[PDB]
Design a binder for this molecule. Sequence first.
Ligand SMILES: Cc1cccc(Nc2nc(N)nc(CSc3nccn3C)n2)c1
Length: 274
Amino acid sequence: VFHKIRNEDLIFNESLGQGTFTKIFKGVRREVGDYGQLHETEVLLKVLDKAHRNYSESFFEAASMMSKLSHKHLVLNYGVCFCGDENILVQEFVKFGSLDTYLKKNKNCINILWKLEVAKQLAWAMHFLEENTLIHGNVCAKNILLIREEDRKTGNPPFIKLSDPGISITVLPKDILQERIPWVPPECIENPKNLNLATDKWSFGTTLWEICSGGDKPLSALDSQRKLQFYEDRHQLPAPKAAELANLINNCMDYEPDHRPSFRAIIRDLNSLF
Ligand SMILES: Cc1cccc(Nc2nc(N)nc(CSc3nccn3C)n2)c1
């Protein structure tokens, strides 16, 4: 159960746009920290309308279940504000934000070894979730958060976290799932009840395609109906220009869910590209 944060300890400063049925803000939380020190902590606030009850329950149950598994590559949620007509997730503010925007802002001037390190870190997060049999269900580059940039002097790589899962595709409207092709796997387009650990292997492949493509969105030129035809004709994504990960992408985006490799196997594969 999330720690309850009082509305009077939350300051909303900047509107940052929308997620899927969420409104996003930057703000500050006033809190008591270690040694009793009084802090004003930068937070990322995700607002859900309590009138969308099924969506809010799904969102917060997913955030809560993943925050029960503390891990270096999983986002920190500080708690929640049951804030009148809205329920608000109070999350850590990750300094460099979403990875797809970061890669665009850096004009894909990122070397393959950087991409390999981020891919390995996500794979280790996903292996942890797999070992815990916890489905994330919305793995994508917008949900990879860059804590720190590479530091060439120390040799330290970039460091990422995986963000909260959001509303489950088992409750979302079908038209939203189709818009989310090719992150949502073919079996879930056929029936959202096919959500499974295998779902995250597919979406991991799509996310590696994003990373290798400098934050482009696959199939962006296709409307929903052509995205369904993509899957009907069982096509595979084009190799990214950073084609070093094309084989892994295709191996994870296997139309047969039971053939998608374990994250332990994915990590070994990534290591062998060094
Ligand atoms: C540089 C910068 C700019 C904006 C936000 C951050 N920090 C951040 N921290 C967290 N925890 N999560 C996210 C993604 S939330 C989302 N969904 C839809 C839109 N936005 C913004 N960004 C950093």
